[PDB]
Design a protein around this nucleic acid. Structure first.
Ligand SMILES: [Mg+2]
Ligand SMILES: [Mg+2]
Ligand SMILES: [Mg+2]
Ligand SMILES: [Mg+2]
Ligand SMILES: [Mg+2]
Ligand SMILES: [Mg+2]
Ligand SMILES: [Mg+2]
Ligand SMILES: [Mg+2]
Ligand SMILES: [Mg+2]
Ligand SMILES: [Mg+2]
Ligand SMILES: [Mg+2]
Ligand SMILES: [Mg+2]
Lengths: 109, 63, 183
RNA sequence: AGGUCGGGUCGAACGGCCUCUAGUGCAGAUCUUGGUGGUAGUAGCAAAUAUUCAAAUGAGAACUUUGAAGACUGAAGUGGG
């Protein structure tokens, strides 16, 4: 219904990839980002930008960053009505360091 | 579509490997209509099919 | 034509079938028996929940050495699975039977799956290459599936047999004596 | 030993009796040919470092195509003949 909101979060990928096999770290980071967006926005249809994929895979598989700044925008769904009327889109947020920032809702203008 | 033959023709026409060809994802319909080496040459001339640059192997450290 | 043993009104029934479906007979039997006797929309909703892993198909007969799960608690069983391919085929046949029923002009809300049966189709065979240069079989066990959805009717009947009685002279005298001794 | 009738299925030939004749009666032969089970939805589908994101097509995409990213073979190559 309502809540087309868009926010910026900081995901701590270190504690989520602790103990993971080295050749599965980045795919598990992708899966945990999808699960994180589902947790926060309640949306099961999570689309990640290829720029976010590049930001994850910038250092190979086992070089995933400890913290990552994300922009998650819950959008109204379209396209030949699907299962869910809402879908989430995850952009990367370019920043110097992803440390020290708390989550903030961003205004759409 | 299936642009395998288009990429192969573009590699053989430009003179580089298939790893150095760039078929833009927006002109997929025109690339699919392109079925000959002449049409591939036209696409290369108007910039739909681009030859990527060589991945550099710098000799500065060894110099 | 020539479906299985059914006991229902064909005027209040619709049917669907699929033959030579390349899906495992052992999984389709459990998928059919899970919904046998259910309301149609309830069964379809349950099948989508199975596809989304919220509920499970209980495995009763073909269940040896399969894993345990919590979702069998609904059916008092410990072994259940999610046979997605069988659910796809069965819900396709359910959609076809609902279409046949609404074409027949049936109520479409009193519909329950009265009959559903699966039996074995002819096998589709391939080869397996085993150690020391041997050949074995690698065969699919496909399924013939059929189902009949019927309208839920009212109470069946009453007025049982006349129950003709045979009484001896002594029994008749006893009855007459009691009828005299009472009011 | 077997024979007979009823019911159902089926569609074109078959029986009783007196005799004649034999390639004449199966539970076995690690019997022959063919078919089918339990095992069992089980063993398992684990060598060769590794895949990921978006779009397109399509009824349907872990695997098809394109792009991007990450990798590998490393010229006694997973290349070209
Ligand atoms: Mg560990
Ligand atoms: Mg056991
Ligand atoms: Mg086991
Ligand atoms: Mg083998
Ligand atoms: Mg051999
Ligand atoms: Mg005839
Ligand atoms: Mg003999
Ligand atoms: Mg015998
Ligand atoms: Mg004997
Ligand atoms: Mg034998
Ligand atoms: Mg197994
Ligand atoms: Mg193995």
């Amino acid at each position: 219904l309502k809540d087309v909101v868009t926010r910026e979060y900081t995901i701590n990928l270190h504690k989520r990839l602790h103990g993971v096999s080295f050749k599965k770290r980045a795919p598990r980071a992708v899966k945990e980002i999808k699960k994180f967006a589902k947790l926060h926005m309640g949306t099961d249809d999570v689309r990640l930008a290829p720029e976010l994929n590049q930001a994850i895979w910038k250092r190979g598989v086992k070089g995933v960053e400890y913290r990552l700044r994300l922009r998650i925008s819950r959008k109204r769904n379209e396209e030949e009505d699907a299962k869910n009327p809402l879908f989430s889109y995850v952009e990367p947020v370019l920043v110097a360091s992803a440390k020290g920032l708390q989550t903030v809702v961003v205004e759409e203008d | 579509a299936n642009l395998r033959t288009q990429k192969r023709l573009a590699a053989s026409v430009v003179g580089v490997g298939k790893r150095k060809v760039w078929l833009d994802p927006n002109e997929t319909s025109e690339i699919a209509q392109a079925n000959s080496r002449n049409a591939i040459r036209k696409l290369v001339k108007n910039g739909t099919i681009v030859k990527k640059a060589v991945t550099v192997h710098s000799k500065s450290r060894t110099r | 034509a020539r479906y299985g043993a059914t006991s229902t009104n064909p005027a209040k029934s619709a049917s669907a079938r699929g033959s030579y479906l390349r899906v495992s007979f052992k999984n389709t039997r459990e998928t059919a028996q899970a919904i046998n006797g259910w309301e149609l929309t309830k069964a379809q909703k349950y099948l989508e929940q199975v596809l989304d892993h919220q509920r499970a198909i209980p495995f009763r007969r073909f269940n040896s050495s399969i894993g345990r799960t919590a979702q069998g608690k609904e059916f008092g069983v410990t072994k259940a699975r999610w046979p997605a391919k069988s659910v796809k085929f069965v819900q396709g046949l359910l959609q076809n039977a609902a279409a046949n029923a609404e074409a027949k002009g049936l109520d479409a809300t009193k519909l329950y799956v009265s009959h559903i049966q699966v039996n074995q189709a002819p096998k589709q065979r391939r080869r397996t290459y085993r150690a020391h240069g041997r050949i074995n079989k690698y065969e699919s066990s496909p399924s013939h599936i059929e189902l009949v959805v019927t309208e839920k009717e009212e109470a069946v009947a009453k007025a049982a047999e006349k129950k003709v009685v045979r009484l001896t002279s002594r029994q008749r005298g006893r009855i007459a004596a009691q009828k005299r001794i009472a009011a």
